[PDB]
Design a binder for this molecule. Structure first.
Ligand SMILES: Cn1cc(-c2cc(C(N)=O)nc3cc(CN4CCO[C@H](C(F)(F)F)C4)ccc23)cn1
Ligand SMILES: CC(C)CCC[C@@H](C)[C@H]1CC[C@H]2[C@@H]3CC=C4C[C@@H](O)CC[C@]4(C)[C@H]3CC[C@]12C
Ligand SMILES: CC(C)CCC[C@@H](C)[C@H]1CC[C@H]2[C@@H]3CC=C4C[C@@H](O)CC[C@]4(C)[C@H]3CC[C@]12C
Ligand SMILES: CC(C)CCC[C@@H](C)[C@H]1CC[C@H]2[C@@H]3CC=C4C[C@@H](O)CC[C@]4(C)[C@H]3CC[C@]12C
Ligand SMILES: CC(C)CCC[C@@H](C)[C@H]1CC[C@H]2[C@@H]3CC=C4C[C@@H](O)CC[C@]4(C)[C@H]3CC[C@]12C
Ligand SMILES: CC(C)CCC[C@@H](C)[C@H]1CC[C@H]2[C@@H]3CC=C4C[C@@H](O)CC[C@]4(C)[C@H]3CC[C@]12C
Ligand SMILES: CC(C)CCC[C@@H](C)[C@H]1CC[C@H]2[C@@H]3CC=C4C[C@@H](O)CC[C@]4(C)[C@H]3CC[C@]12C
Ligand SMILES: CC(C)CCC[C@@H](C)[C@H]1CC[C@H]2[C@@H]3CC=C4C[C@@H](O)CC[C@]4(C)[C@H]3CC[C@]12C
Ligand SMILES: CC(C)CCC[C@@H](C)[C@H]1CC[C@H]2[C@@H]3CC=C4C[C@@H](O)CC[C@]4(C)[C@H]3CC[C@]12C
Ligand SMILES: CC(C)CCC[C@@H](C)[C@H]1CC[C@H]2[C@@H]3CC=C4C[C@@H](O)CC[C@]4(C)[C@H]3CC[C@]12C
Ligand SMILES: *[C@@H]1O[C@H](CO)[C@@H](O)[C@H](O)[C@H]1NC(C)=O
Ligand SMILES: *[C@@H]1O[C@H](CO)[C@@H](O)[C@H](O)[C@H]1NC(C)=O
Ligand SMILES: N[C@@H](CCC(=O)O)C(=O)O
Lengths: 765, 766
């Protein structure tokens, strides 16, 4: 057990990580040359400047009880019991205040131990968000800000360089656990995620660090990484990475910062690393004090001999067992001396404790400037509550009067966040840390960082931005990385994760949120191709004009009375509807006209053949017979299909392609059923041809009867030729269908000419 | 004074042997009930444990019992020895200390850093249950807030919902009522009032709080969770006001005569919760057989003997005094200390069994005792029968995942009929399950009511409940919903189709329509039979005329016109007979066709017949008269098809009113749509009137010439009677159809009498 005890009226405790695992197997075999020894000497310098100070604690000498921690919380707890030994009531020494540990876990443990005994504690380097809780850490304070501002700064720098997909590794201690969670929160706030998260602990690098490095190398797509991990573990992790030839850009916290002791002989893996360190003004007085230190005059520090032996490999007063005997002519010159950043923090903590003690002495002993019997017993609770948390003083050694000069304590005994940005660089062949930014609540990064590959290292290449016109999200292995595969073949894809089809007769818009129904091709068909049957309709109008001409002779008392007067007008009615039938087919396929379309075709064809059959076969019966079959056919079809199917056109025929919408859906079904009706319609027409083909041959109208047989002969051939073209009608709803009905119109026009040919022959003659 | 016993394993101990004392002395008077009675119990249990073959057969335990005179600071300094020795007696494997809310907190806070397991025996504070601050702390006594579960179970068993909660100023009442409300939520129990009876207040404040509790009669039960003095004062205040309640007591007021004395009238059926403790048959005998001479192990026994008997050892007069003669009252928290030390012993035995198999003694691996595993894996997972049991069902000594030992509570009820007062009777127990006995409870017996406190009232039916809660959700106050609509949910009654009755009895919101077709025989049997008879007569007349249509057709009007008249009258009769039909689009369009077309053709044929007479007075054209009549009919048919395509015919969903029996008899046809054609039939009627005004009469058809005027007058009268009827019967459906059928039949009969009757008379004459 080694300690530095100085007798005095008031004694200040001290916990520093002098012993730490460097290059060896012992837990704390080596000695910290920048973290422990430097801070111990800074505290001693502050104490012995305060003792000789006249404006601060006049006539009162401040003692020290500096101890070791070995960078372990359990060892710190074991060795901190001497601070409360004198409070029970190696002579006990009463500790007025204890300077906090350098590690978050150690500081937490000492705070928990000292809360019960009411001993104020001020830390200099414990930046942990788990602390500052006035429910379990009542007697604790620190000059450094928590990890919240550090995590915010890390998120800001990650967003500045467009770093989205990163790999993360931290420690298992009280420092890594809370800081890493704060980092996760601040990263998910800024819409960035992490590849994986690892937690390391104080153990051999054979298993844990090697596995961490291998896993990090297993995902080459992520290059930049963060380090919420302690310095003692950081050195071993860097050594393992150098052994495995790592190629990552580390983003370090205040644990590593601008410390050159972590990287020694392995500077090629830490090249280009961006490290975060708290902003501090170097103290020239402390620099001179440390440079004036010698092994001989420094009998106060038991660890100074070991520190000198580790800094310069030689024996101070031992035998020649070491590789050299000290030349006795070398000191700590500026060539190999680098003042630690967190030295002014220790100085400020010591001076704040001294100021609190001095002000309490002044308010408790107004008459004399000396310790009194009333202050023999110290009330730590009241001291911390009022005279420590409400202190405001200029920095002990600062030639400026800026904001940083004033040392204050927040409501939680916290500090202000001004984390500097440091980048590892190689200039002139000498590796050194160069400041490239300053997080004064606003990131102020300068473009001077030297990266690993002399270029801005990219990331998030697995999930690149993609246009939402056809791309879709797919995450087979990890939630973060997505592949923008092309989906939605003419379908809406409003949801980015999944793509689904609009359905039949629907076309998506540019927004991919609402499918639009394209206009029907059958509707508004009167412009280019459907005007073809309009000429046939015009020919049908000429046929209608011909229908006007044929009855003129029949109206003006025709001489030929052999032909039935009623029969002649009956057959003219059938051909008239045939000319008018084609108008419905080429018109707008309205629901009203669909039912009329089938009635027009079925009735006109039936009555035309019925009238011819009756004419071939006193005169009362042929008129009644013609109406009987015509009425029966019209009545039968009424109660068969049209009164049952309830035809209603709609969108259909979109199976072949989504860019096609037929206006008829139920009417198209009736069109398919009309094929059976067409065969039934031609069944009676074909039967009529055979029944009266040169069978009766009445001498009164033998020429007409022979001509009438010719009309039946040409109709069956025309009707039969229409069947093959009706099958390909469905292929062209707005093209083939219009031409399909032209066959009926052509047959009607042909029938009218030949039937009335004997009638017009007499007129011409 | 430090009590140390030789043993392989040394167990710590902290007891309040001395009281708080004055400012001058750290420890004051010696406590003979809470500091020495429990210490001797621990020593006796340790001796029995060391003499138990089945509990550490080879390893003998020791003691390091210390004293904490009810001071947090002194307890901290004493417990510092436990953690200093581990880093010089044997390392303290376990500590059985902790008898106060703050002393236990301090000990747990100090011992958590060094990983020393600790089980308290008398600390009921709920703040120690937070494992985020106390990792290695356990306790045998259940925490004070564990009675909230028993209270909620009792309230649920008695169907009590509108309860009143009373809290205290200290951590006892507060931390209980907090999460007592939470347990009430899980039991569908709401809190009416949350008055806080805390620090010392005058009787005026007590009267005020009892008045605020009684201001609503819906809350007849109160849940007191305060101290004994607060409960006693509340009972006194209630008795002064003479109020009636069913207070549910707690550990503060349990089997205590100092809380209910003087307030017997106020409390008659109060439920009392008391922690169950059983006497030890051997601890009392061990305690009587104790003297300060032989029992030199206890350093404080000399002071106990001096203070208890008011003697001193300097006069040598304490030999006459004896402890066996003095009656012994066992403390309630003695079995808890015994259970705690036995739990430590069982945990050590489990450690030895699962860690040192080959060695029956203290194995080498047991030398570095670690509190983390020993606590977490084993102490929270011990299950053994309680030592020195009276052979009851209290053989369960277990610790929960939060380091809180289970507890058994005795549910007492303050009876008053047996002896007037002081009749605390156990009616059940709470050991992981409610076992209340309603037979012993007076008001639970079938000679009274449960004295309920129900939030408002719930007498509403399933179909007539709205659950509209103004201020109290637990009230479930209901508003009668619409009788013509069902409910969407039990919690929220929503009108599901209020127009017609849905399947309320089937719990579904789907509407259930009734197809009330116009088929009722009362208003149809007559008109249908009349129309059928008229149609049969018209068909017979037409057939008779057609059979002998050789001589009369040429002499009289043309045969085509007679056939047109016959077809028109037949169509009119058919339309009249078929007017009744189901509410379908086909029926509607067929009616719209026929009703107009038959009349139009029947009058157009008559006009054409009159046109032939008018031509006698271009050309007569007998063959073209039928064509002209057909054109006249076709014009009306074109008008009909136009008004049929522009009107979009359909079938109405229902002709019923907003709230009445379901009936569907209306059609898409409207009065304006009917009048559109009625204009054309009015023009036809005007043409017929003009033809009648052409009074020239043929000698063969002299009667028919005047009959045209009769037909026109009949049609005009029918229209002028139907139009006001149509206006009046616009809402009516059955009446309108009957009127239309009657008018159609009358018109058909008039036409038949005008046309066929002269022909029949001529045929009969010939
Ligand atoms: C001499 N006489 C003529 C007819 C006749 C004839 C006809 C016709 N268009 O063939 N349609 C009628 C419709 C109706 C119904 N009304 C009731 C609803 O409102 C409307 C109105 F006009 F009444 F306001 C319609 C009634 C009588 C009709 C009957 N007898
Ligand atoms: C019912 C109406 C609205 C539409 C259909 C009208 C039809 C059935 C009409 C229009 C023209 C009519 C024809 C006109 C003239 C004659 C000559 C006559 O000597 C016998 C009847 C006969 C041959 C008619 C038969 C029926 C007929 C074809
Ligand atoms: C084109 C379609 C709709 C009808 C085809 C048949 C047409 C041309 C026929 C059927 C009925 C016929 C009419 C029947 C009777 C007459 C009366 C006569 O005094 C003059 C001719 C006239 C007016 C006829 C003209 C031609 C006519 C209208
Ligand atoms: C005297 C002769 C020429 C008359 C012949 C009948 C004419 C007028 C009829 C027969 C078929 C009719 C068409 C049938 C269907 C439609 C579609 C509708 O959306 C607008 C009217 C329109 C386009 C009709 C216009 C009039 C029309 C062309
Ligand atoms: C002189 C005669 C032959 C004319 C006959 C015309 C008939 C067939 C026409 C005229 C008006 C037509 C109706 C007009 C509108 C509709 C609504 C539609 O949702 C279903 C079909 C339906 C109900 C039609 C059915 C057929 C219909 C009744
Ligand atoms: C071309 C489109 C508009 C379809 C037209 C269909 C028309 C012409 C049809 C449908 C129903 C048919 C009627 C059905 C029955 C009969 C009874 C018979 O004893 C004389 C013919 C007559 C009166 C028909 C005349 C023509 C008719 C009205
Ligand atoms: C000659 C005059 C007086 C009468 C003619 C009657 C004709 C037009 C009638 C008789 C049967 C009728 C059909 C009967 C049933 C239906 C089904 C319905 O969903 C639409 C109308 C429709 C398709 C009707 C259209 C008109 C129709 C064909
Ligand atoms: C609106 C509708 C119902 C009116 C009637 C339509 C039908 C049934 C009519 C119109 C024309 C009529 C025909 C006109 C002329 C003759 C010649 C006669 O010697 C016998 C009857 C006969 C053959 C008629 C039969 C019925 C007939 C076909
Ligand atoms: C349009 C709807 C009602 C379907 C019925 C279509 C047919 C059957 C109708 C429509 C218009 C009608 C024509 C209208 C006018 C005349 C002139 C007349 O001197 C003879 C009959 C005749 C030639 C009709 C015959 C039947 C007809 C062609
Ligand atoms: C006039 C004679 C010679 C030929 C018969 C023409 C008939 C079939 C024509 C003439 C006018 C036509 C109508 C004109 C306008 C419309 C409105 C439209 O929304 C549906 C079709 C409908 C209702 C047509 C149906 C067919 C129609 C009635
Ligand atoms: C990050 O990307 C933005 C464009 O989204 C660009 O303007 C900016 O310069 C980038 N920052 C870098 C490359 O550091
Ligand atoms: C409480 O109500 C239930 C019905 O919900 C009943 O079964 C039970 O007996 C009641 N408890 C009493 C009356 O103590
Ligand atoms: N701030 C870090 C380490 C500080 C340091 O010692 O450099 C921690 O709390 O562990």
């Amino acid at each position: 057990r080694r300690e530095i005890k100085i007798e005095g009226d008031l004694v200040l405790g001290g916990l520093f990580p002098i012993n730490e695992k460097g290059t060896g197997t012992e837990e704390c075999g080596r000695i910290n040359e920048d973290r422990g020894i430097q801070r111990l000497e800074a505290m001693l310098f502050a104490i012995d400047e305060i003792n000789k100070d006249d404006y601060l604690l006049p006539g009162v000498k401040l003692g020290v009880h500096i101890l070791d921690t070995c960078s372990r919380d359990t060892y710190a707890l074991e060795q901190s019991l001497e601070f409360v030994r004198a409070s029970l009531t190696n002579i006990p020494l009463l500790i007025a205040g204890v300077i906090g540990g350098s590690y978050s876990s150690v500081s937490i443990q000492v705070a928990n131990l000292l809360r019960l005994f009411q001993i104020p504690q001020i830390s200099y380097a414990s930046t942990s968000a788990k602390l500052s809780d006035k429910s379990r850490y009542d007697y604790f304070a620190r000059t450094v800000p928590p990890d919240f501002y550090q995590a915010k700064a890390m998120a800001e720098i990650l967003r500045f360089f467009n770093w989205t997909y990163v790999s993360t590794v931290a420690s298992e201690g009280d420092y890594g656990e809370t800081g890493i969670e704060a980092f996760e929160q601040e990263a998910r706030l800024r819409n960035i995620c992490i590849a994986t998260a690892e937690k390391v602990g104080r153990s051999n690098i054979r298993k844990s660090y090697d596995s961490v490095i291998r896993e990090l190398l297993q995902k080459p797509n992520a290059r930049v990484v963060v380090l919420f991990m302690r310095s003692d573990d950081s050195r071993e992790l860097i050594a393992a990475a150098s052994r495995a030839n790592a190629s990552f850009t580390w983003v370090a916290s205040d644990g590593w910062g601008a410390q050159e002791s972590i990287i020694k002989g392995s500077e090629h893996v830490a090249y280009g690393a961006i490290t975060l360190e708290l902003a501090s003004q170097p103290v020239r007085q402390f620099d001179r004090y440390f440079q004036s230190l010698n092994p001989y005059n420094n009998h106060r520090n038991p660890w100074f001999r070991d520190f000198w032996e580790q800094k310069f490999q030689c024996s101070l007063q031992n035998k020649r067992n070491h590789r050299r005997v000290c030349d006795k002519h070398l000191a700590i010159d500026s060539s190999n001396y680098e003042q630690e950043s967190k030295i002014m923090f220790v100085v400020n903590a010591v001076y704040a404790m001294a100021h609190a003690l001095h002000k309490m002495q002044r308010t408790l002993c107004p008459n004399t400037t000396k310790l009194c019997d009333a202050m023999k017993i110290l009330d730590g609770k009241k001291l911390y509550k009022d005279y420590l948390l409400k202190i405001n003083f200029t920095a002990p050694f600062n030639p400026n009067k800026d904001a940083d000069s004033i040392v204050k304590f927040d409501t939680f005994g916290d500090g202000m966040g001004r984390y500097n940005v440091f980048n590892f660089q190689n200039v002139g062949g000498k590796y050194s840390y160069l400041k490239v930014g300053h997080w004064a609540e606003t990131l102020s990064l300068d473009v001077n960082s030297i990266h690993w590959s002399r270029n801005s290292v990219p990331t998030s290449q697995c999930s690149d931005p993609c246009a939402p016109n056809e791309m879709k999200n797919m995450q087979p292995g990890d939630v973060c990385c997505w592949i923008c595969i092309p989906c939605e073949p003419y379908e809406y894809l409003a949801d980015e994760f999944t793509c689904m089809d609009c359905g039949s007769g629907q076309w998506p818009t540019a927004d991919l949120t609402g499918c639009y129904d394209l206009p029907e091709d059958y509707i508004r068909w009167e412009d280019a191709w459907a005007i073809g049957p309009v000429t046939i309709a015009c020919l049908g109008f000429m046929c209608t004009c011909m229908v006007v001409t044929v009855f003129i002779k029949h109206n003006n008392t025709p001489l030929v009375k052999a032909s039935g007067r009623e029969l002649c007008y009956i057959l003219l009615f059938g051909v008239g509807l045939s000319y008018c039938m084609t108008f419905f087919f080429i018109a707008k396929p309205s629901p009203v006209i669909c039912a009329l379309r089938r009635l027009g075709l079925g009735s006109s064809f039936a009555i035309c053949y019925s009238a011819l059959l009756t004419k071939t076969n006193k005169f009362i019966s042929p008129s009644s017979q013609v109406f009987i079959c015509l009425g029966l056919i019209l009545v039968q079809i009424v109660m068969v299909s049209v009164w049952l199917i309830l035809e209603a056109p709609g969108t259909r025929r979109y199976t072949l392609a989504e860019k096609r919408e037929t206006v008829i859906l139920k009417c198209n079904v009736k069109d398919s059923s009309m094929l059976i009706s067409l065969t039934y319609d031609v069944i009676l027409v074909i039967l009529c041809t055979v029944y009266a083909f040169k069978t009766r041959k009445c001498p009164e109208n033998f020429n007409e009867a022979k001509f009438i047989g010719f009309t039946m002969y040409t109709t069956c051939i025309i009707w039969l030729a229409f069947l093959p073209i009706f099958y390909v009608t469905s292929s062209d709803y707005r093209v083939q269908t219009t031409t399909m009905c032209i066959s009926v119109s052509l047959s009607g026009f042909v029938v009218l000419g030949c039937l009335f040919a004997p009638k017009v022959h007499i007129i011409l003659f | 004074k430090v009590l140390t016993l030789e043993g392989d394993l040394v167990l710590g101990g902290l007891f309040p042997v001395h009281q708080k004392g004055g400012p001058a002395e750290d420890c004051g008077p010696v406590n003979e009930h809470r500091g020495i009675q429990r210490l001797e119990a621990m020593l006796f249990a340790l001796d029995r444990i060391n003499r138990d073959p089945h509990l550490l057969p080879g390893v003998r335990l020791g003691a390091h019992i210390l004293d904490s005179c009810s001071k947090d600071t002194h307890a901290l300094e004493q417990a510092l020895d436990f953690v200093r020795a581990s880093l010089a007696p044997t390392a303290i494997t376990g500590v059985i200390g902790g008898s106060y809310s703050d002393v236990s907190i301090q000990v747990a806070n100090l011992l958590r850093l060094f990983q020393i397991p600790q089980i308290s025996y008398a600390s009921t504070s709920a703040k120690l249950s937070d494992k985020s601050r106390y990792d290695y702390f356990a306790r045998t006594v259940p925490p004070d807030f564990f009675q909230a579960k028993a209270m909620a179970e009792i309230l649920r068993f008695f169907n009590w919902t509108y309860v009143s909660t009373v809290a205290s100023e200290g951590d006892y009442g507060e931390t209980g009522i907090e999460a007592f409300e939470l347990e009430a939520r899980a039991r569908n129990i709401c809190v009416a009032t949350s008055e806080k009876v805390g620090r010392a207040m005058s009787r005026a404040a007590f009267e005020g709080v009892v008045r605020a509790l009684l201001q609503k009669p819906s809350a007849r039960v109160a849940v007191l969770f305060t101290r004994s003095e607060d409960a006693r004062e509340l009972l006194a205040a209630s008795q002064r006001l003479n109020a009636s309640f069913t207070w549910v007591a707690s550990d503060g007021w349990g089997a205590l005569e100092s809380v209910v004395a003087g307030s017997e009238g106020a409390a008659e059926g109060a439920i009392t919760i008391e922690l169950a403790s059983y006497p030890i048959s051997d601890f009392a005998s061990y305690f009587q057989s104790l003297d300060p001479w032989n029992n030199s192990r206890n350093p404080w026994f000399r002071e106990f003997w001096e203070q208890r008997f008011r003697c001193s050892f300097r006069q040598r007069d304490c030999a006459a005094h004896s402890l066996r003669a003095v009656p012994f009252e066992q403390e309630s928290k003695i079995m808890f200390v015994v259970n705690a030390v036995y739990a430590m012993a069982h945990a050590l035995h489990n450690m030895h069994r699962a860690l040192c198999p080959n060695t029956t003694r203290l194995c080498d691996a047991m030398r570095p005792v670690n509190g983390r595993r020993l606590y977490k894996d084993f102490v929270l997972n011990v299950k053994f029968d309680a030592p020195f049991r009276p052979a009851d069902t209290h053989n369960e000594v277990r610790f929960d995942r939060f380091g809180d030992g289970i507890g058994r509570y005795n549910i007492f009820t303050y009876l008053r009929a047996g002896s007037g007062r002081y009749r605390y009777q156990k009616v059940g127990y709470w050991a992981e399950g409610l076992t209340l006995d309603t037979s012993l409870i007076p008001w639970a017996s079938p000679s009274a009511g449960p004295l309920p406190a129900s939030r408002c009232s719930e007498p509403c039916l399933q179909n007539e409940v709205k659950s509209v809660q103004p201020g109290e959700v637990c009230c479930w106050l209901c508003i009668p919903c619409q009788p013509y609509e069902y409910r969407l949910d039990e919690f929220t009654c929503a009108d599901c189709g209020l127009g017609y009755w849905p399947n309320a009895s089937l719990t579904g919101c789907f509407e259930l329509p009734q197809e009330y077709i116009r088929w009722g025989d009362a208003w149809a049997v007559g008109p249908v039979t009349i129309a059928c008879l008229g149609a049969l007569a018209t068909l017979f007349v037409l057939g008779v005329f057609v059979r002998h249509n050789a001589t009369p057709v040429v002499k009289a009007s043309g045969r085509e016109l007679c056939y047109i008249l016959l077809g028109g009258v037949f169509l009119c009769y058919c339309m009249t007979f078929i007017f009744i039909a189901k509410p379908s689009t086909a029926v509607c369009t067929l009616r719209r066709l026929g009703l107009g077309t038959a009349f139009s053709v029947c009058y157009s044929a008559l006009l054409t017949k009159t046109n032939r007479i008018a031509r006698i007075f271009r050309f007569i054209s007998p063959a073209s008269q039928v064509a002209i009549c057909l054109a006249l009919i076709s014009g009306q048919l074109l008008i009909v098809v136009a008004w049929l395509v522009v009107e979009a015919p359909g079938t109405g969903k229902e002709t019923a009113p907003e709230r009445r029996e379901v009936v569907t008899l209306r059609c898409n046809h409207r009065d304006a749509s009917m009048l559109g054609s009625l204009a054309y039939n009015v023009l036809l009627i005007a043409l017929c009137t003009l033809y009648a005004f052409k009074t020239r009469k043929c000698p063969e058809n002299f009667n028919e010439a005047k009959f045209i005027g009769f037909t026109m007058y009949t049609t005009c009268i029918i229209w002028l009677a139907f139009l006001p009827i149509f206006y009046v019967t616009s809402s009516d459906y059955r009446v309108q159809t009957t009127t239309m059928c009657v008018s159609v039949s009358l018109s058909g009969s008039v036409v038949l009498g005008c046309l066929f009757a002269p022909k029949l008379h001529i045929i009969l004459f010939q």
